Amino acid sequence: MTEYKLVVVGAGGVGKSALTIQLIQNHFVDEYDPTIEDSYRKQVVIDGETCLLDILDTAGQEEYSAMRDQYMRTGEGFLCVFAINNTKSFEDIHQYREQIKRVKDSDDVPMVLVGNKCDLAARTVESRQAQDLARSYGIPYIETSAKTRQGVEDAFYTLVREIRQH
Template sequence: MTSRGIRRKKSSLSEVKVAVIGAPSVGKSDVLCITALTVRFLTKRYIGEYDHQQDSKYKHEALLDGEPILFEILDTCPKSLDELPGNEIAQWADGLFLVYSITDRESFNYVRRAKQSLHPDVPLTLVGNKADMVHLRQVSPEEGEILAKDFECSFAEVAAAEQVNQVGEVFHELCRDVLSLRKRAKHSLLDRMLGSKSAYRVYSRGKSDSALPKD
């Protein structure tokens, strides 16, 4: 009885695939900001040093507005600033994070180029990490807002080193956007199906009426 209940609960989970994209780290001691963001969300811990050498996928279950969500997160790992993500990532993902460091102008330029290479048709969020390091800031909040407007996406500045709740919220907001898009697509499909059936019924009725024997 219990096992069946667990299976039903797991099968009812909404699954959301998220790709986290950003520039490569400049060194092992300077943790890749996209990895710091992902690990903070997954474990609520901050990593100060991480040797990130390949793309990694994680699964994480979380409650969103009282409903369980299964996140599948792809943490990308470009080898150089010239290596841009392939469009297969946008095709795999339900939602995308483009992450840069506010202390690194080159990472900001990288996400601009990455967006141009992706052409995503999914919800997107631009995230400026390391917002706690304002004394080293190279990218202003206004520049982030302008780029987000250009991308037609949401924007947030966070500090993965200090902000647990804020990092969690950017993941949750992207998830809400994904679920909202799914809901609209489902309603649109249903409307089209009902519209087609309605048109078919009208056509059938007209055809059968015209086929009635005349006195």
Template sequence: MPEKFRLVMLGPLGVGKSALTVKYLTQKYITDYDPYIDGKYSKLDIVGHEPVLARVWDTYAHPGSYTELEKYIKWSDAMIVVYSTTSKESFEAAQTYLKHIHVHFRNKGLETQPIMLVGNKRDLDRYREVDFYEGQEMADRFHCLFQESSARGNVNAVYSVFHNTIKQIQQERAFSRAEPSSAMTIEPISSTGSLPKSLSRRSKATSKSTGTSPKPLKKSSSTFKIFNKGFRLFT
């Protein structure tokens, strides 16, 4: 059986969470779908020359989204927080998601899960409102992986979002198997929203941009299941 990895897509409406998800599952770009439906999907994939089963929960944003974070966190192995590079408002919403996630783990006295921060819609550079360095700075502050991507663009850039997130989970699991668990000292979050480094084992090296596209995948027996969203797919 391939190892299972559960990823939750988080972010405000309209940033392209579903478009990224379906591009990863099918290599196709979608423009027409119901943004108000949660969907869970499965894909057999190859990451680091190993077979994996990726489970992706594509959530939708609504007024109670932040209160449901515990449900998403409990289910997931990692979170992918998405904003649009064309919307400063969505960037600020992504920061709010990150703050709520880390407060949750701080209050539970637990170490954070891997988090990938994604600036989507980089193909719409003429409408850009959020610079690359702003996304990188926020990722560094919250100890996240970071990259910009585009569901409309090359599929390898989308693969790298999911593959790099899965690789981070693999590293965390390998670390956990190698090291005995130990008590953590939880420090308060500063007034600026910055996080204490003790909340994460990840070094600054892991928070550098992973925006380089991986080599195209070799053809394999990858499969996927789409359950309930009724996407319209475009080649």
């Protein structure tokens, strides 16, 4: 089985940990406990092939912003997460994109753009706006809810597919 190093990045509170824990444990975390750096493992069959996913769950709080290079070096693919009810988190996306490209010195890094908390009615970021950005990056856009599981497997396993064909 092939091992895949996935990294989940994005502004504080967008739901990076909730997405990851929903994927790993099928459980929604209601608490907001700011992450420093957590690691998870998941054996899963994707398109008929057994994969071992290593998922790095990173810090969104700005106070940790000087410590990103080290995990960007190791990651093979990145979930770039914002919350669809948080415009600033969407604006923070391009900063993650650029840093990842710089660190790995590549314009061809496997990535998926994720618009989380799609269970909430009070949207402030329109799907079209996020889709436009995704197309300019050449990557898919998937809306998710760590709460209901909507899109969660799709987001993570799409990222695996991109690494696989990289």
